[PDB]
Amino acid sequence: TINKLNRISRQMLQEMGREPLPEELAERMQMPEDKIRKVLKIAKEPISMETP
Amino acid sequence: YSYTEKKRIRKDFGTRPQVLDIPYLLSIQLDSFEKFIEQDPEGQYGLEAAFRSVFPIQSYNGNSELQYVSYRLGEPVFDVKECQIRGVTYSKPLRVKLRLVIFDKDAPAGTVKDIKEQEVYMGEIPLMTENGTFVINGTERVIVSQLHRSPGVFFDSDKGKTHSSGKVLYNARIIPYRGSWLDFEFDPKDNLYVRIDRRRKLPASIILRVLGKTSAEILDIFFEKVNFEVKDQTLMMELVPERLRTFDIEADGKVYVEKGHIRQLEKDGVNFIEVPVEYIVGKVSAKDYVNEATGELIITANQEISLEALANLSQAGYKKLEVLFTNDLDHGPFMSETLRVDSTTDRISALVEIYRMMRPGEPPTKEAAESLFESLFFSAERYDLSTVGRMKFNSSIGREDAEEQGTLDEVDIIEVMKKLISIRNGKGEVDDIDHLGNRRIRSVGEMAENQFRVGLVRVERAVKERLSLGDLDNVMPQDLINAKPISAAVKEFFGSSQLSQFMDQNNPLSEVTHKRRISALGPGGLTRERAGFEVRDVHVTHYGRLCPIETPEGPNIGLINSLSAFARCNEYGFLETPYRRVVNGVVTDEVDYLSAIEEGQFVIAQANAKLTEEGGFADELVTARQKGESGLHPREHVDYMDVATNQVVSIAASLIPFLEHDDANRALMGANMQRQAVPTLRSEKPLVGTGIERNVAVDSGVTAVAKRGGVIQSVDASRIVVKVNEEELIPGEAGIDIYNLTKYTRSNQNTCINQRPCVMPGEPVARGDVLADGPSTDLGELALGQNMRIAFMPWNGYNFEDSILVSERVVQDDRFTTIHIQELSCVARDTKLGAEEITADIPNVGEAALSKLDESGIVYIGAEVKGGDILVGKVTPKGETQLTPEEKLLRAIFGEKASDVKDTSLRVPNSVAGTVIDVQVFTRDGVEKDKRALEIEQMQLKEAKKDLTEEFQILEGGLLARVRSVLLAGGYTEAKLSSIERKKWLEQTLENEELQNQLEQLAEQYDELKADFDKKFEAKRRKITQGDDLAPGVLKIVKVYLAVKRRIQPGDKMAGRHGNKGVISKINPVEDMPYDENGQPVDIVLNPLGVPSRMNIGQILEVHLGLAAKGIGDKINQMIKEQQELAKLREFLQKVYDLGDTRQRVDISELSDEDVRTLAHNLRAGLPVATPVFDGAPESSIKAMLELADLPASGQLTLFDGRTGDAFERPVTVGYMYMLKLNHLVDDKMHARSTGSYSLVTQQPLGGKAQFGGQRFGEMEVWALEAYGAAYTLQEMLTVKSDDVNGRTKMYKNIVDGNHAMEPGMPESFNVLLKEIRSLGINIELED
């Protein structure tokens, strides 16, 4: 789901020229916008406790 | 004189005419970015250069390729201001035209089967603001230039500090812009070795072999040959005359000395010399000699000839033998001995050994070795000796070809070897590593290009991978590339780079100095624990290029420098300085920019050189400099002169008056300290200045400068509308200019940015005139501090060390009061339990704390708040909490229980009191807008429409004025026109075609005006209404801006411009401070003891000159108050401006009466004087100014003690000094903590004021306590104050119980220690 969201947001960005808003991404995925926001916020890799 | 300068003319004490005006101070940024962004039709700079360096992208098979055509930048979605408001990067879209060309497999290679044109988005490129800054993530940042080493070859030596003996060892190092390094060293055994990327040493004959050089070829290249023949059964020396100048010499007619000058006998000239056989024994063969009959090698190249070998070639019939030249002074056998220790004998073995040293532990194959050596230095993809690197390389070897080459070759390497061998021999010298022709400047354009090229290569790898598949029938160019790595690279450079720094914004000088800063640190530069003393010193080539004064005092000394006043960067990145030409003995107006290399040859005169009326020098011998050494040179041998007296120093040092009387240490401190000054409520000019302030103020961008001249139609504290002149108007333009002024906007250092109008309605203004003054600006002049009355004496110990005694009148007059604006943000997020809500229903808080919030839960605009007050109310859902039984009982007794939500609201920090000046609400797209956000949206839309309608009104007034001017070319009566109502003008009916056509034209123009106004307002509403791109999980953000007035108090730091800093110790009452005979008290008392030992004498001279200037101002004030005649006012002003033999000719006779009144009014508070650095006012001029004002010629008055009335026993130096309020305030540095937060792992108190942390008791403190013997205090600090979890709670309870006893235990840090040591598989434990 994350990978194919990345690819669809890829294609939309390259076709319109700007970062696609979650509403248009949900429209292209045929999935609810709440699910799109859940996927987008799911888990970015934890930052290290030694970052200067 | 311009209108802004005519309002207050500063008296100039300089004596040397200025022939070149100082250049624009922010050129180093704008020029570099223009190079980066502007289209380059020749393709050496910027985006075009990167695109041509990566493209065309060729598939490995050859099926198809992607080619670049052109690029363009789109229009920004937002401008600078709203980019700052929302918090987004100010940038432009990158659109590149690419063609996918697909070849035909059946057809021969190179046949264009198909083409596909398309425009592709390649990322977002950040833009430079007009002031040389970037707006990244809503913050202003400056990217500082880097001082690195120029690409090419450097020849160095160890200076005899490595081997046991001296034995100075020489090495050569080649460094490209991109690629691998190469090194060639000499060992203490006089053999030459090669290093590739700093790994194991090699014989260094390998590379020549790789290129295909036989041992004979190497010997031919690296040595000269001496010949031998067998002539008439005799040994036959081919004599070279220069060589001869221990045996008997032939040519019996001209016998030379035998076994015991040369030129006299060599004059005749003979070609026959006989030498003994033993002279051959020591020689080394230069060729490989083969015998056809034997089929073997009789003698090898680089082999010592022996008697048996001589006999062998004698029988072989060979009569000519050539051997190598070898001496101990001029020529050396170094390369031959190098060949002897070389085990390789062929090219394949050479590549094998190079591979083994490159990749140890890998099976070497011929193809892999060939690919590795080709890619190391002779591949365009992995090696690039750039244009600057190529020219430096060519100049080093003296090669005059291959200017556009980017890779090495046989010629380059062999010339490098030849130069290194030559320097070993004695001819040639090593290179200077700090010499500014050897170090290069790399600016924002170059590193932006570099990072863009990195991202482009990142794209190109995947594009090549995709193109190689083959299925390309339905692919477009926009489906092949990957914009996100490019965006990642540019945002890496603009957001996380060491050189992309938070903008210094204390004052305009801080901005200008930050933009003109050169750092040797950063990527590709120096590290601070690996940079020695030599790089930190002032090289002799810094003259006019890097300021020798301005550098940070601390670990970074010498590594961060400031551009000089007239310094410039040439097209290759090397600093150059202007000089005046000297022709026919006269010093001309023509200027030439010289680099470090060029400067050494000529003899350059100083700006202090005396000159005659004819343009030449007066003295027969003039003080000049050549090859970095100063001396006395004849007048006829001088080739250049300096253009200005501030050419050596930076801008901050150029702002220090009487700099030549200050030691370099205190000048350094003063230059560093002028950038920490905080702007005050009222900005005051410096009475004693240098004449540079106008340039800094205008070029900083803080002021509002007129783009076109005209008359100021409308003035208001936020707007200036100017009507442009007729002569300078563009055809078909509105004719009017609008300037919106920044009002009370927070800076990066939480200071105040305010622009105040300095014009009148109707005042004539020209181009370049200042209309509004920004922070620390007064009528277009930089104003960093205030003019303060100063007495130099001790006062009862209150100015002990560097302490400052300040009068109460200074605090009353609010002279050093500052406005500080602070940002506070409350973010309502989405959590597991529920959504955090912004509301006014705050549990456990009464109506006393809800007075200042509105219905939506946000404070009102203009609310005076103090510490602990609630700004924005927020409640967060909370889960079930275990109630202790003895609180369940209390719930039972009194039944109140309201704990559904927890109060997490934004509160004013402690010891912070101020006024709410602005509140902004950002709501996620799809979240309900509360009442307050709707109110902000409505007011924003109303203000936007009001401003747009106001513009329309004023520009339509200008346009209709121009139309009226067009009609008045004939001239009629417009009363008839006004007889018909304005709208009814569109209702007229015309039957004549001539009039009807004009009527239709006017109707169409009116329709177009309506359409454009509607489009503009629709776009503005779209921008206002769109939802914010809040972070994932964030529902709402509210931002509150607090304005705090800070008054001076003890503990604050004050300073002048001469390194004299101090801390205010007392605010003395006015009746206790020293006063003169007229009853006027001093304002600040400074300690004289700090002057003599620090050798900063410019401050005494500044004090005396300020006394004189204030006296002259008092005279003007008096002459205005008594309403004296204008003739005597003019006479006094002319007498004042004619004092001294200066370069300034101010003629009051050419100023109008109103102009004279304005000038006299602006001189009421003192006469501003300019004393340029190294061209300043002498003692005699200062004393003459003092006598003009009827003040003592010594600058010392008689002062009386306010406490007693008794006169002091000695006269005291009293004058006026420009003081600054540095951004080291006791409000931001006072901190205290009893008990607060603790660390997660170490369970120790946090660190810092923001975390309410605790002070650190370091190792040296523990040593001090051990030396005292205070065991119990030390145990308290170790255990019950830091990390004994139970002990610290017990200590708190005991103190509350009034017991004052502790029960120390084991620190948690020791338990963590034990756990990690056990995790390292080591049994560590405690025995009982």
- Show the 3-state SS of B574-601: CEEEEEEEEECCEEEEEEEEEEHHHHCC
**Closest in A14, A18, A21 to B478, CB measured:** A14
Distance CA B648, CA B707 (A): 32
Min CA distance, A51 vs chain B (Å)?
A: 12
CA angle, residues B856, B861, B866, in degrees to nearest 5: 95
Nearest to B690 by CA among B782, B561, B788, B567: B782
CB-CB contact of B507 with B679 (8 Å): yes
One-character DSSP codes across B675-712 = TTBPP-SS----SEE-S-HHHHHHHHS-SEE-SS-EEE
Length of chain A: 52
First to last CA, chain B: 91
* DSSP letter (8 states) at residue B417: H
Residue recorded with tokens 């690629």: B179
How far apart (Å, rounded) are the C-alpha atoms in residues B679 and B776?
Answer: 5
Distance (Å, rounded) from C-alpha B640 to C-alpha B919? 60
DSSP B44: -
Sequence-ordered list of residues with C-beta below 8 angstroms from that of B1119, at least 6 positions apart, any chain? B1128, B1129, B1132, B1160
Angle between helices B444-467 and B27-37 (to 10 degrees): 20
Going from the C-alpha of B1261 to that of each of B342, B765, B966, B1255, B1258, the distances in angstroms are 61, 65, 85, 11, 5
CB contact at 8 A, B715 and B685: no
Q: With contacts defined as CB-CB under 8 Å, which chain B residues touch A21?
A: 925
Residues ≥6 apart with Cβ < 8 Å to B1058 = B656, B658, B662, B666, B667, B670, B1096, B1098, B1099, B1102
- Nearest-Cα distance to chain B for A41, in Å, is 6
Give me the residues of A, 10-39, that contact B with CB < 8 A. Answer: 10, 13-15, 17-18, 21, 23, 33, 37
Distance between CA atoms of B513 and B670, rounded to whole angstroms?
14
* Burial degree of B271 (CB within 10 A; 0-12, 13-18, 19+): exposed
End-to-end CA distance of chain A: 33
> In B813-927, which ranges are continuous DSSP H helix?
885-893
Helix, strand, coil fractions of chain A, as percent rounded to 5: 60, 0, 40
Q: Which residue has the tokens 């090696």?
A: B383
Strand partners, B579: B592, B642
| Residues B403, B394 contacting (CB under 8 angstroms) | yes
CB-neighbour burial class of residue B1328 (10 A; exposed 0-12, middle 13-18, buried 19+): exposed
CA dihedral B1145, B1149, B1154, B1159 (to 10 degrees): 30
Q: What is the DSSP letter of B273?
A: B
Asked if the Cβ–Cβ distance from B925 to A21 is below 8 Å, we say: yes
A2 touches chain B (CB under 8 A): no
Instruction: Count Cβ atoms below 10 Å from residue B657 Cβ, excluding itself.
Output: 31
Rounded distance, CA B786 to CA B680, Å? Answer: 9
At residue B965, φ and ψ (nearest 5 deg) are: -65, -40
Q: A37: which chain B residues are within 8 Å (Cβ-Cβ)?
A: 1032
Sheet order of strands, B57-58 included: B57-58, B64-73, B91-103, B112-126
Q: Name the amino acid, one letter, at B415.
A: E
Give CA–CA dist B674/B44, Å, rounded.
Answer: 40
**Half-sphere exposure (Cβ direction) of B566: Cα atoms closer than 13 Å:** 24
Cβ–Cβ < 8 Å for B1289, B1282? no
Q: Give the helix/strand (H/E) hosting B1034.
A: strand B1034-1046
Q: How far apart are CA B1061 and CA B1038, in angstroms?
A: 40
Cα gap A44→A37, rounded to integer Å: 13
Q: Of B1316, B731, B1178, whose CA–CA distance to B966 is shortest?
A: B731
CB-based contact A15 B1033, cutoff 8 Å: no
Q: What angle do CA B185, B186, B191 make, to 5 degrees?
A: 120
* Cβ atoms of B1111 and B1228 closer than 8 Å: no
Short-list B569, B526, B536, B627, CA closest to B388: B569
- Tokens 């229009």, residue located: B75
Within a 10 A sphere around the Cβ of B606, how many other Cβ atoms?
A: 16
Q: Which residues pair with B792 in a beta bridge?
A: B1086, B1213
CB atoms within 10 A of CB B153: 24
Cross-chain Cβ contact A23/B925 below 8 Å: yes
Q: What is the DSSP string of B276-333?
A: -THHHHT-BB-S-EE-TTT-SEEE-TT-B--HHHHHHHHHHT---EEEE---SSS---
Quickly count: other Cβ atoms within 10 Å of residue B870's Cβ.
Answer: 23
Residue among B74, B483, B1033 minimizing CB distance to A14:
B483
Query: Technique behind this structure?
Result: cryo-EM
Q: Reduced to 3 states, what is the DSSP secondary structure of residue B846?
A: coil
Written in H, E and C, the secondary structure of B511-549 is: HHHHHCEEECCCCCCCCCCCCCCHHHCCCHHHCCCECCC
Strand, coil or helix: B1233: coil
Closest-approach residue (CA) in chain B for A33: B926
Count Cα atoms within 13 angstroms, Cβ side, for B1257: 17
SS3 B1122: coil
Nearest to B877 by CA among B857, B904, B912: B904
In angstroms, this model's resolution equals 2.7
The tokens 């790789």 sit on which residue? Answer: B210
| The two three-digit tokens of residue B504, written as one number | 């210094």
Bridge partners of residue B805, in order along the sequence: B1066, B1085
Strand B517-519 vs strand B145-149: parallel, antiparallel, or unpaired? parallel
DSSP state of B1044: E
Residues B1161/B1167, Cβ–Cβ less than 8 Å = no
Question: Residue B345 is encoded by which pair of tokens?
Answer: 């004998």
Q: Give the whole-angstrom CA distance, residue B15 versus residue B1141.
A: 7
Distance in Å, alpha carbon of B94 to nearest chain A alpha carbon: 9
Burial of residue B877 (number of CB atoms within 10 Å: 0-12, 13-18, 19+): middle
Residues of A in contact with B95 (CB under 8 A): 17
Q: Which amino acid is at B815?
A: R
B1070 C-beta neighbours (distance < 10 Å), count: 14
In Å, how far from its chain's centre is CA B367? Answer: 48
Inter-residue contact B1280 to B1302 (CB < 8 Å): yes
Strand partners, B1125: none
Neighbours of B1306 (CB within 10 A): 15
Q: Quick count: other Cβ atoms within 10 Å of Cβ B221?
A: 14
Cβ(B1042)–Cβ(B1049) below 8 Å: no
Q: State the DSSP string of B172-227.
A: EEEE-SBS--EEEEE-TTS-EEEEESS-S-B-S-HHHHHTT--HHHHHHHH--EEE
Which three-class secondary structure state does DSSP give residue B559? coil
Compute, in degrees rounded to 10, the torsion defined by CA atoms B646, B652, B655, B660.
Answer: -60
HSE of B99, CA atoms in CB hemisphere, 13 A: 12
Within 13 Å and on the Cβ side, how many CA atoms surround B369?
21
CA distance B406 to B390: 7
Give the separation between CA B812 and CA B804, rounded to whole angstroms: 17
Give the alpha-carbon dihedral of B1025, B1026, B1029, B1033, to 10 degrees.
70
Kindly state the helix (H) or strand (E) to which residue B397 belongs, with its residue range: helix B387-397
Mark yes or no for CB contact B120/A14 under 8 Å: yes
Q: Which residues contact B667 (CB under 8 A, 6 or more apart)?
A: B549, B653, B656, B659, B1058, B1059, B1096
What span, in angstroms and rounded, lies between the C-alpha atoms of B635 and B621? 6
Instruction: Kindly state the tokens that stand for A31.
Output: 């999935």
CA–CA separation, B1261 vs B1272, rounded Å? 14
Q: Measure the CA–CA gap between B187 and B206, rounded to whole angstroms.
A: 17
Phi-psi region of B792 (alpha: psi -120 to 50; beta: other; left: phi over 0): beta
Measured between beta carbons, the chain A residues lying within 8 angstroms of B835 are none
Q: How far apart are CA B559 and CA B534, in angstroms?
A: 11
Number of CB pairs, chain A paired with chain B, less than 8 A apart = 22
Burial of B685 (0-12, 13-18, 19+ CB in 10 A): buried
Produce one character per residue of B843-863: b if its CB has 16 or more CB atoms within 10 Å, e if not: eeeeeeeeebbbebbbbeeeb
Q: For residue B468, give the DSSP letter.
A: T
B892 Cβ contact partners less than 8 Å away, ≥ 6 residues apart = none
Q: How far apart are alpha carbons B222 and B226 in whole angstroms?
A: 13
User: Side chain identity at B393, as an amino acid letter?
Assistant: F
C-alpha B660/C-alpha B658 separation (Å) is: 5
Q: Do B483 and A13 touch (CB under 8 A)?
A: yes
Instruction: State the nearest Cα–Cα gap between B467 and chain A, in angstroms.
Output: 18
Stretch (H or E) spanning B560: strand B560-562
Query: How far A35 CA sits from the closest chain B CA (Å)?
Result: 13
The answer to whether the beta carbons of residues B726 and B758 sit under 8 Å apart is no
Helix (H/G/I), strand (E/B), else coil: B898: coil
CB B1201 within 8 A of CB B795: no
Which residues make Cβ contacts (< 8 Å) with residue B373, sequence separation at least 6?
B210, B351, B354
Long-range CB contacts (within 8 A, 24+) of B457-463: B457/B54, B458/B482, B458/B485, B458/B486, B458/B489, B459/B54, B459/B483, B459/B485, B459/B486, B460/B54, B460/B55, B460/B57, B463/B57, B463/B66
Q: Is B826 helix (H, G, I), strand (E, B) or coil?
A: strand
Three-state helix/strand/coil letters over B109-176? CCCEEEEEEEEEEEEEEECECCCCCEEECCEEEEECEEEEECCEEEEEECCCCCCCCCCCCEEEEEEC
Identity at B747, one-letter amino acid code: S
Cα separation of B1215 and B1094, whole Å? 20
Separation CA B977–CA B985 (nearest Å): 8
Of B93, B1032, B1033, the CB nearest to A17: B93
> Is B1032 in contact with A40 (Cβ distance < 8 A)?
yes
Of B753, B829, B821, B747, which Cα lies nearest the Cα of B1040? Answer: B821
Q: How many of the other CB atoms lie within 10 Å of CB of B144?
A: 22
Token match 């109303």: residue?
B942
Q: Report the half-sphere exposure of B181 (CA within 13 A, side-chain side).
A: 11
Specify the length of chain B in residues.
1328
The one-letter amino acid code at B420 reads L
| Phi and psi, residue B224, nearest 5° | -95, 150
- Do residues B350 and B206 make contact, with C-beta atoms less than 8 angstroms apart? yes
The verdict on whether omega for the bond into residue B548 sits within 30 degrees of 0, i.e. cis, is no
Contacts for B173 with CB less than 8 Å, ≥ 6 apart: B153, B154, B156, B181, B182, B183
- B1159-1198 in b/e burial notation, b at 16+ Cβ within 10 A? bbebbebbbbbbbbbbbbbeeebbbebbebbebeeebbbe
